[PDB]
Amino acid sequence: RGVFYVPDGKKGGEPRIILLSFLGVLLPSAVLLTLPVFSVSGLSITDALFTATSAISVTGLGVVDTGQHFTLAGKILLMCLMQIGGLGQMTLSAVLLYMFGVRLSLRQQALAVNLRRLVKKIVTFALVAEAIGFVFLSYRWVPEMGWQTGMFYALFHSISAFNNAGFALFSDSMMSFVNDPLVSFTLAGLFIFGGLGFTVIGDVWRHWRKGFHFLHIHTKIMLIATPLLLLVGTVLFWLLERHNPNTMGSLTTGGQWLAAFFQSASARTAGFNSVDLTQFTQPALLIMIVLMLIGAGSTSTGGGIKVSTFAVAFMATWTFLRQKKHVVMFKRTVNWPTVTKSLAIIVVSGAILTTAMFLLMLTEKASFDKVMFETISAFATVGLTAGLTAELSEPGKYIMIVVMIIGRIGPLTLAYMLARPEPTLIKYPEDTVLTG
Amino acid sequence: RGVFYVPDGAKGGEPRIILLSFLGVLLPSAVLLTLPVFSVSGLSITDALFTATSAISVTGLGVVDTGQHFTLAGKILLMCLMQIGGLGQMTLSAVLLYMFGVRLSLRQQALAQVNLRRLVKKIVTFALVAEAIGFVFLSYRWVPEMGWQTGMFYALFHSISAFNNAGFALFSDSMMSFVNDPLVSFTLAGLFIFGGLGFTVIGDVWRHWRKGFHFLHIHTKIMLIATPLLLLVGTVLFWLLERHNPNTMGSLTTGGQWLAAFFQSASARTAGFNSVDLTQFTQPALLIMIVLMLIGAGSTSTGGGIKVSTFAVAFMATWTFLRQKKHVVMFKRTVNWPTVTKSLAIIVVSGAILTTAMFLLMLTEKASFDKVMFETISAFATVGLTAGLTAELSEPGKYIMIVVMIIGRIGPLTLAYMLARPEPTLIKYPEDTVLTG
Amino acid sequence: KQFAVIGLGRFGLAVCKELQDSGSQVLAVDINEDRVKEAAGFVSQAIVANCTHEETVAELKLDDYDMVMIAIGADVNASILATLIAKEAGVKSVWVKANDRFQARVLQKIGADHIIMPERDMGIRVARKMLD
Amino acid sequence: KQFAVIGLGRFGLAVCKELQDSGSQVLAVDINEDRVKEAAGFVSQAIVANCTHEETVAELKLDDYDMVMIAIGADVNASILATLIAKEAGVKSVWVKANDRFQARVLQKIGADHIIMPERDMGIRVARKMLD
Amino acid sequence: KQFAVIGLGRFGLAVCKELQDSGSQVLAVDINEDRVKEAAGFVSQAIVANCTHEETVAELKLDDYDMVMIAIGADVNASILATLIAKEAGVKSVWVKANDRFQARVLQKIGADHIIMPERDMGIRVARKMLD
Amino acid sequence: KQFAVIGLGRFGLAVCKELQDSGSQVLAVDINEDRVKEAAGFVSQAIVANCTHEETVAELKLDDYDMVMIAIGADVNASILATLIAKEAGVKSVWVKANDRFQARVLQKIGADHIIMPERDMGIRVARKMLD
Numbered sequence A: 001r002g003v004f005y006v007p008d009g010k011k012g013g014e015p016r017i018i019l020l021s022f023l024g025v026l027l028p029s030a031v032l033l034t035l036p037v038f039s040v041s042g043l044s045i046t047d048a049l050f051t052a053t054s055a056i057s058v059t060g061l062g063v064v065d066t067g068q069h070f071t072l073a074g075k076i077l078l079m080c081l082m083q084i085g086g087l088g089q090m091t092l093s094a095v096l097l098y099m100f101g102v103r104l105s106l107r108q109q110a111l112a113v114n115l116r117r118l119v120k121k122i123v124t125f126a127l128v129a130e131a132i133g134f135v136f137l138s139y140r141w142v143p144e145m146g147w148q149t150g151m152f153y154a155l156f157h158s159i160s161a162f163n164n165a166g167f168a169l170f171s172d173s174m175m176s177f178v179n180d181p182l183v184s185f186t187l188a189g190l191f192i193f194g195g196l197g198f199t200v201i202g203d204v205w206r207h208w209r210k211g212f213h214f215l216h217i218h219t220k221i222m223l224i225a226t227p228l229l230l231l232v233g234t235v236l237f238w239l240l241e242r243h244n245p246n247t248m249g250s251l252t253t254g255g256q257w258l259a260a261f262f263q264s265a266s267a268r269t270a271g272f273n274s275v276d277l278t279q280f281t282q283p284a285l286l287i288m289i290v291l292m293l294i295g296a297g298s299t300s301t302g303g304g305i306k307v308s309t310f311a312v313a314f315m316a317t318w319t320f321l322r323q324k325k326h327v328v329m330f331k332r333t334v335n336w337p338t339v340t341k342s343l344a345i346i347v348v349s350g351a352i353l354t355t356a357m358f359l360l361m362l363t364e365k366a367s368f369d370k371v372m373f374e375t376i377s378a379f380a381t382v383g384l385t386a387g388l389t390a391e392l393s394e395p396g397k398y399i400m401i402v403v404m405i406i407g408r409i410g411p412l413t414l415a416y417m418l419a420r421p422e423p424t425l426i427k428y429p430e431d432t433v434l435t436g
Numbered sequence B: 001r002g003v004f005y006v007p008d009g010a011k012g013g014e015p016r017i018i019l020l021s022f023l024g025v026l027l028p029s030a031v032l033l034t035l036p037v038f039s040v041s042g043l044s045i046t047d048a049l050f051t052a053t054s055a056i057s058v059t060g061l062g063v064v065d066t067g068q069h070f071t072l073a074g075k076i077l078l079m080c081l082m083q084i085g086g087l088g089q090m091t092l093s094a095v096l097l098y099m100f101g102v103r104l105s106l107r108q109q110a111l112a113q114v115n116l117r118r119l120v121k122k123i124v125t126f127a128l129v130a131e132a133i134g135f136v137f138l139s140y141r142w143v144p145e146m147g148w149q150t151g152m153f154y155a156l157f158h159s160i161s162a163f164n165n166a167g168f169a170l171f172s173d174s175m176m177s178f179v180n181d182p183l184v185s186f187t188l189a190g191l192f193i194f195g196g197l198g199f200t201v202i203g204d205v206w207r208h209w210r211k212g213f214h215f216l217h218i219h220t221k222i223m224l225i226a227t228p229l230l231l232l233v234g235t236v237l238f239w240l241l242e243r244h245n246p247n248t249m250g251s252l253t254t255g256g257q258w259l260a261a262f263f264q265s266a267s268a269r270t271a272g273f274n275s276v277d278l279t280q281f282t283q284p285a286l287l288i289m290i291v292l293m294l295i296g297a298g299s300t301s302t303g304g305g306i307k308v309s310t311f312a313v314a315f316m317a318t319w320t321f322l323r324q325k326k327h328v329v330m331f332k333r334t335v336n337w338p339t340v341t342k343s344l345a346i347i348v349v350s351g352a353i354l355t356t357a358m359f360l361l362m363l364t365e366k367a368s369f370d371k372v373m374f375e376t377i378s379a380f381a382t383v384g385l386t387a388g389l390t391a392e393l394s395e396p397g398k399y400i401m402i403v404v405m406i407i408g409r410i411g412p413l414t415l416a417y418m419l420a421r422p423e424p425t426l427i428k429y430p431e432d433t434v435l436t437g
Numbered sequence C, D, E, F: 001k002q003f004a005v006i007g008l009g010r011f012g013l014a015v016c017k018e019l020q021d022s023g024s025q026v027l028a029v030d031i032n033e034d035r036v037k038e039a040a041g042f043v044s045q046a047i048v049a050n051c052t053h054e055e056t057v058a059e060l061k062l063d064d065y066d067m068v069m070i071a072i073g074a075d076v077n078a079s080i081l082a083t084l085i086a087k088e089a090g091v092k093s094v095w096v097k098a099n100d101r102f103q104a105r106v107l108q109k110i111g112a113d114h115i116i117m118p119e120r121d122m123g124i125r126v127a128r129k130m131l132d
């Protein structure tokens, strides 16, 4: 329909809409969590702030047990909070991408669908996916849990899985269903689809008849890297943890593969664990850290540096090692600003991660692998715990809250700053600096 | 004088000269170390390959003790190797930098400085004078203690090692007996600071100091400012984190703590000597030193990791990006986007190789992540500081360290020249957007 | 009371400045974002849009506006097509600025209610000013 | 069947869109990256290349394609150069768009198999269309 | 003393090299980044900017500098605009290079304080030098 | 036996190819790197250098060479200046290619031993081939 927009007046304001929107749901969500209606014992200001940040950023990290410490009304709020986190982040990303495309198209016309329809498709896709997951989970839990409690658990866990949240109502988050394929595959399909990105889902929905060859480059990158990432993670986790008695040694051959696939998928932002990461071999925690950093798709409910960013950096590296002039992906040149965006995102993420690990090591006393794993899980919004979150101190909790906030919104925000820098009237002469 | 070159006859060949030069000296150095003339007991193939790679890359990692396992002839060979590895990289990197400027200068004239021999003479002259100044200061103390003939040898070995940013020591505990000795510590500290500063910085200051700091080249200004802050921040951070640790710095005097903190702050940037024990360092101090090792020394110096200027460009590119400024500016100069991409690519590629190397080390040998990560960075950053992993390194682990030491030594320089001259192409595919963030 | 100005060049920006200073609602529309930002401070609402696009003109309720000024000068086809689309949209009065006599003839035949030729009209005006 | 279309103006993009709509794989080549991007949406493979360059054409492997259509309109020199290079690259059937009767005769001498004059041939076609 | 030199051609770079050799701090401004680079080697501060833009000149803070030298030679329009903007900025002394007598008269009317005609003034100098 | 060719254009590269076929040492030098690479496979030694640079000509010991050919056509000033520098370099035999009659006049007076005008010289021979 109508392609138009109102200019801001006076740099892009996408960074400002991204932060204000998060803090405008975090502070209200925090002030609500302190009320005793939602907690059996009540949450302190630090604990309530941590829980609000973990829910709104859908990190899933818990200073208190979700199933026990919250009341019936508190869990309903938690579904609302993580639903807002995941779905609203996906919707806001799609909306900002739509406005970016509109401004770009009008600029192109100057030199030489509907938003409401888009938002409707985002919500309806989420509701359909969550309803499918809810039906599949109810088919397994309702017989053993009742017609009321089993339905509630199915809805809660379907919402958590789609939103890539990882909140669980059990004391051990899905460790009792390591050998259950139905629930494991139900949850796995929920955050793979929830974390795929609505751009990919829409491109496949509208242009699957044309074939894979005519899908957008981002869609092809996701549809190839996501199966590759899942398969690599599954094979690596199975190889590195098949002989470990404490996590996967006791399971059957099918159980071991199911657990390995579940961790390979849950690492990419969901945060559920069918095994204990506290008892994982270090070669496997490094693999899972790498998987957590990559994260889910760009315009999805998940987090991480995003699969597309890792793909452009991996392909740029191959281009540089082969001394090729252009970064080519699926017979398309990746423009140098995109490569610079991906590399800058990785470098800035590494800098903030190093600062956060150093601060945690100052405030809390723990080994480096545990602190690094927790920092990566909080920054990437996976929320997998390695036994360090349970002993977080007050400054540690504040650092974790800040890291979860910056992790959730940092990549998209930094991407949009690189897109629209402030124009300048003064340029200094270019001079060369030696590198390497 | 004459500005000309013979074209190879269109991708750059600087990457191939860099690798062939290292391997052209690695293999001859490896075979010599196996002969019993240089070792009291003789080195196996892997040990000699490790020792030669450590000497040629001037990493300084030792599977065997340098002072005891090697003979008098073996130590003389070791000085030759680390002089070839350190001064040789500065000589070769400056030589390749000169030819890059020659090709760039003639390209500008087609569209619209001293000779190589004088440059090489100044580089070797600057090295020998720098070592000679460090030689007499080290001789001033060890000759009374250890005699004339032995005193000059230890002064020469350590002055050469310090300048070349090698870290090889003839003592069982490398400079842990001289933590409270300012003359030994400061003489060594000055040697790898200037040895690691870079000849372009030394040359620019030497020829244009009268003009002032304002008219120095932008690279010189970065190295003249970032190095003191890297030294100062490292000195303060190490002192703050280890002032109360009895095992490393709690037993020293107030001056001794600052002397130790400054020494490790300086030695981390590629030298590899240690007044204290990193095996008994607080984890927050290992993380600080890992960052310091990764940054490394200057661009055209005897040692380095990713290099200070690479970190500085990425540091201020990040600051530019977070403020949404269109250009990266340093000292009223715009850093062009290809330079920014080079700095970011080096860090990302280095992390890719580092992560692969740490993962392999945990499989071949069993150790904690902090021990493996610290050793992998030191081998890659060429610092050679050990946290106990090298002592118990397994046979496959030695192969990984040799590869990491080779790639870490030449990787940042080689990757920079790959980015400088990519192969020209006749087929371009349409530009398409990929969503990131 | 309520006016629309399409095209925010030197002429259209002057129209917007005078109209808003007089105290009326002015929707300033220009495909170029810089001129829309320049006129944003003055007009009640400034929108970046392509008025050659029929669906965009449908979305912008130009039929509700009392008068619509089309001030596109460089591309004659853009002005003619914008006039046609505005007339199809139900705009009762369309004022079009024309730089050439052939463009003025075409716009008159299309159905523009007022054709403005700034150089000729100011020629007459300043001649009358010189006479008295 | 595989077709190569060189030049992506009004004629070249119309041939590609018609050829690809029928299930044939088309290679679209142009020096203007904007038109290569525009064609890349629906064309099996699109490449930014200079087809007067004889080494570039060897990389495109135009000898493999059954028919090569050269639709360079404004640059006549590029049109004859591309036809010559395509013929020297061993292309069985070369179709060339010519804007003049003099260019068509030169292309006949070069070795073009089918030569299309868009203005003259479409004129004949519309003249037949009005009659019947 | 602070000097600002706008335009870094033969005259502008000669004035800057002399001013900086004499121990004065000069600002070199030019739109051609290529020429700004040679100046940056020996000039206290060199900036790539367009000096016909009012906001850009306000950013340069030319009113701080004692004298502003405008050495735009080929583009007489740019020279006139730069002199006008510098005077409107509030710079006390403006020296402008003019390659024509008519340009010199226009610059006198604008408000330039010292106008240098390099060809004619150099001719007078050379004649005096040959005489003595 | 031993020759030098400065400037590797169409004319200069033709000299290098024929000189090599007769088994003679040829030093091909050109400012542009691409043209030197083309002659790299046709000469004993191909060097990228600026022969307008006096010190560069000193390093390339052109006085040892029996004949030096300057084949710079587009920039008249470079060919005149390179011819002079070769004369102070001690080159006994200097052959210069000139594209214009005015350039051929200057080259004669500055001391070029042989001035080659390819259009005029080829004009005379082609007439002779036509006659017989």
Ligand SMILES: CCCCCCCCCCCCO[C@@H]1O[C@H](CO)[C@@H](O[C@H]2O[C@H](CO)[C@@H](O)[C@H](O)[C@H]2O)[C@H](O)[C@H]1O
Pocket: A013, A014, A015, A016, A017, A018, A019, A020, A295, A303, A304, A305, A306, A345, A346, A348, A349, A352, A379, A380, A381, A406, A407, A408, A409, A410, A411, A412, A413, A414, A417, B322, B323, B324
């Ligand atoms: C989930 C995986 C996360 C890792 C992948 C990438 C992470 C990248 C982190 C980039 C750095 C954090 O990004 C940080 O965002 C804040 C806003 O929250 C920015 O601050 C910004 O706030 C407002 C509102 O957003 C912006 O309009 C404005 O441009 C700026 O003030 C900081 O300038 C930036 O440093």
Ligand SMILES: CCCCCCCCCCCCO[C@@H]1O[C@H](CO)[C@@H](O[C@H]2O[C@H](CO)[C@@H](O)[C@H](O)[C@H]2O)[C@H](O)[C@H]1O
Pocket: A135, A138, A139, A140, A142, A143, A144, A145, A146, A147
């Ligand atoms: C669009 C939304 C659709 C939602 C779809 C949900 C599908 C869920 C399918 C569940 C299948 C039927 O699940 C059924 O659950 C009931 C109620 O607990 C179980 O319960 C059954 O045994 C228990 C004994 O403990 C009795 O008390 C109960 O009255 C009886 O129904 C049954 O064993 C099981 O057959």
Ligand SMILES: CCCCCCCCCCCCO[C@@H]1O[C@H](CO)[C@@H](O[C@H]2O[C@H](CO)[C@@H](O)[C@H](O)[C@H]2O)[C@H](O)[C@H]1O
Pocket: A129, A130, A132, A133, A136, A181, A182, A183, A185, A186, A187, A188, A189, A190, A193
């Ligand atoms: C909306 C996104 C999420 C949707 C995800 C995809 C649909 C949900 C997962 C479907 C696949 C899992 O489906 C599961 O398959 C396994 C086969 O291993 C079988 O699972 C079976 O396990 C054992 C036998 O092995 C039985 O005791 C159990 O009762 C039964 O469920 C069933 O067929 C189904 O439980």
Ligand SMILES: CCCCCCCCCCCCO[C@@H]1O[C@H](CO)[C@@H](O[C@H]2O[C@H](CO)[C@@H](O)[C@H](O)[C@H]2O)[C@H](O)[C@H]1O
Pocket: A210, A211, A212, A213, A214, A223, A224, A226, A227, D025, D044, D045
């Ligand atoms: C969430 C996980 C999803 C898993 C599935 C996603 C991955 C799907 C992989 C399918 C791969 C198909 O592989 C790709 O097929 C296309 C057809 O579209 C082939 O394309 C081929 O036919 C098309 C016509 O359609 C031609 O235009 C093209 O020139 C030719 O190469 C590609 O050469 C091949 O690379």
Ligand SMILES: CCCCCCCCCCCCO[C@@H]1O[C@H](CO)[C@@H](O[C@H]2O[C@H](CO)[C@@H](O)[C@H](O)[C@H]2O)[C@H](O)[C@H]1O
Pocket: A239, A240, A241, A243, A244, A245, A281, A282, A283, B356, B362, B363, B366
């Ligand atoms: C270019 C990049 C190449 C990437 C290469 C990837 C190679 C993948 C090989 C995976 C190897 C799996 O090898 C597996 O290692 C683990 C962990 O060390 C060993 O595990 C062993 O040590 C661990 C301690 O870490 C104990 O907890 C465990 O009980 C014991 O079995 C397994 O016995 C071995 O089977």
Ligand SMILES: CCCCCCCCCCCCO[C@@H]1O[C@H](CO)[C@@H](O[C@H]2O[C@H](CO)[C@@H](O)[C@H](O)[C@H]2O)[C@H](O)[C@H]1O
Pocket: A179, A180, A181, A227, A228, A230, A231, A234, A252, A253, A254, A255, A257, A258, A261
């Ligand atoms: C390309 C991306 C990566 C693709 C990843 C593919 C992962 C495939 C995982 C296969 C999982 C193993 O498959 C699953 O094995 C389990 C465990 O035995 C079987 O489980 C069944 O038998 C076991 C006995 O071992 C019982 O304890 C269990 O209650 C019952 O459900 C399931 O019926 C089967 O579905």
Ligand SMILES: CCCCCCCCCCCCO[C@@H]1O[C@H](CO)[C@@H](O[C@H]2O[C@H](CO)[C@@H](O)[C@H](O)[C@H]2O)[C@H](O)[C@H]1O
Pocket: A221, A224, A225, A228, A229, A232, A233, A290, A291, A310, A311, A314, A315, A328, A329, A330, A331, A332
């Ligand atoms: C735990 C670690 C896991 C590491 C996993 C690494 C995965 C990295 C992302 C891979 C995603 C898919 O990546 C994509 O693969 C397709 C496969 O045809 C490539 O496809 C392309 O290959 C080359 C690229 O010059 C060309 O033949 C052509 O352009 C196209 O076929 C893309 O260039 C690449 O970007």
Ligand SMILES: CCCCCCCCCCCCO[C@@H]1O[C@H](CO)[C@@H](O[C@H]2O[C@H](CO)[C@@H](O)[C@H](O)[C@H]2O)[C@H](O)[C@H]1O
Pocket: A352, A353, A355, A356, A402, A403, A406, B322, B323
């Ligand atoms: C490890 C724990 C977390 C620590 C890491 C935090 C990462 C996120 C960094 C947020 C950075 C915000 O800082 C970002 O840059 C500067 C500094 O305020 C602001 O910049 C603004 O104010 C400064 C003040 O001097 C002006 O000079 C500048 O011109 C203006 O743009 C940006 O508007 C803000 O967005």
Ligand SMILES: CCCCCCCCCCCCO[C@@H]1O[C@H](CO)[C@@H](O[C@H]2O[C@H](CO)[C@@H](O)[C@H](O)[C@H]2O)[C@H](O)[C@H]1O
Pocket: B135, B136, B139, B140, B141, B143, B144, B145, B146, B147, B148
């Ligand atoms: C061109 C480079 C020149 C390098 C110059 C370096 C000069 C360094 C001089 C250091 C000071 C002189 O150091 C001097 O060492 C000698 C030799 O051990 C000592 O003299 C020694 O002689 C013998 C050695 O067994 C013993 O009697 C006794 O141990 C001691 O007297 C002196 O007590 C000390 O004064």
Ligand SMILES: CCCCCCCCCCCCO[C@@H]1O[C@H](CO)[C@@H](O[C@H]2O[C@H](CO)[C@@H](O)[C@H](O)[C@H]2O)[C@H](O)[C@H]1O
Pocket: B130, B131, B133, B134, B137, B182, B183, B186, B187, B188, B189, B190, B191, B194
């Ligand atoms: C070539 C590059 C390397 C050159 C480095 C710079 C020159 C070498 C270091 C010079 C500075 C160290 O110089 C050192 O200063 C300290 C002061 O703390 C003093 O050191 C002193 O320490 C104690 C007293 O405190 C005495 O027992 C000792 O004998 C004496 O050396 C001396 O003056 C000198 O030993």
Ligand SMILES: CCCCCCCCCCCCO[C@@H]1O[C@H](CO)[C@@H](O[C@H]2O[C@H](CO)[C@@H](O)[C@H](O)[C@H]2O)[C@H](O)[C@H]1O
Pocket: B211, B212, B213, B214, B215, B223, B224, B225, B227, B228, E025, E043, E044, E045
């Ligand atoms: C290895 C460690 C070495 C440590 C020493 C290296 C760091 C030295 C820091 C010196 C800093 C001088 O600081 C810098 O001085 C210069 C003079 O050159 C000042 O420059 C000033 O004077 C110069 C004239 O010389 C003017 O051209 C310039 O416009 C003006 O700003 C800078 O404004 C100031 O930033």
Ligand SMILES: CCCCCCCCCCCCO[C@@H]1O[C@H](CO)[C@@H](O[C@H]2O[C@H](CO)[C@@H](O)[C@H](O)[C@H]2O)[C@H](O)[C@H]1O
Pocket: A355, A361, A362, A365, B240, B241, B242, B244, B245, B246, B282, B283, B284
């Ligand atoms: C934006 C980035 C900001 C960067 C902020 C940098 C802040 C620097 C503060 C340094 C703090 C030093 O604080 C110091 O920490 C160490 C290590 O934990 C404490 O050390 C304590 O725990 C360690 C274990 O790690 C014991 O070995 C030691 O014996 C004991 O004292 C010191 O008692 C305290 O003095």
Ligand SMILES: CCCCCCCCCCCCO[C@@H]1O[C@H](CO)[C@@H](O[C@H]2O[C@H](CO)[C@@H](O)[C@H](O)[C@H]2O)[C@H](O)[C@H]1O
Pocket: B180, B181, B182, B228, B229, B231, B232, B235, B253, B254, B255, B256, B258, B259, B262
């Ligand atoms: C800007 C970059 C960073 C700059 C870094 C500056 C670091 C400064 C380090 C100062 C070191 C302390 O200074 C040094 O203290 C030691 C230890 O007491 C003194 O040492 C002296 O006294 C001590 C007693 O404590 C004796 O044991 C010792 O034998 C003797 O040499 C030295 O005479 C003095 O030189």
Ligand SMILES: CCCCCCCCCCCCO[C@@H]1O[C@H](CO)[C@@H](O[C@H]2O[C@H](CO)[C@@H](O)[C@H](O)[C@H]2O)[C@H](O)[C@H]1O
Pocket: A321, A322, A323, B013, B014, B015, B016, B017, B018, B019, B020, B296, B304, B305, B306, B307, B346, B347, B349, B350, B353, B380, B381, B382, B407, B408, B409, B410, B411, B412, B413, B414, B415, B418
């Ligand atoms: C000391 C700190 C180190 C960390 C800082 C930066 C490290 C960056 C590492 C870049 C990757 C390693 O760089 C690796 O170099 C080898 C050569 O040795 C390259 O391989 C190259 O070898 C030859 C000879 O060098 C080159 O002419 C040719 O272009 C290519 O074949 C690899 O393509 C590249 O991957």
Ligand SMILES: CCCCCCCCCCCCO[C@@H]1O[C@H](CO)[C@@H](O[C@H]2O[C@H](CO)[C@@H](O)[C@H](O)[C@H]2O)[C@H](O)[C@H]1O
Pocket: B222, B225, B226, B229, B230, B233, B291, B292, B312, B315, B316, B329, B330, B331, B332
């Ligand atoms: C272990 C971690 C240690 C942290 C150490 C970080 C060291 C970083 C080295 C930075 C090197 C200096 O880097 C250079 O600094 C100068 C100071 O003159 C900055 O100079 C500029 O800063 C900003 C840029 O908007 C403005 O105030 C102004 O234009 C100018 O002062 C440059 O933008 C930067 O390129």
Ligand SMILES: Nc1ncnc2c1ncn2[C@@H]1O[C@H](COP(=O)(O)OP(=O)(O)O)[C@@H](O)[C@H]1O
Pocket: C006, C007, C008, C009, C010, C029, C030, C031, C032, C035, C049, C050, C051, C052, C053, C071, C072, C073, C074, C075, C078
């Ligand atoms: N299709 C269109 N829709 C809306 N505005 C347009 C369209 N085409 C042109 N314009 C605007 O109309 C304005 C008038 O242009 P013009 O008369 O050339 O003024 P100028 O000469 O100052 O550019 C232009 O600034 C342009 O942005």
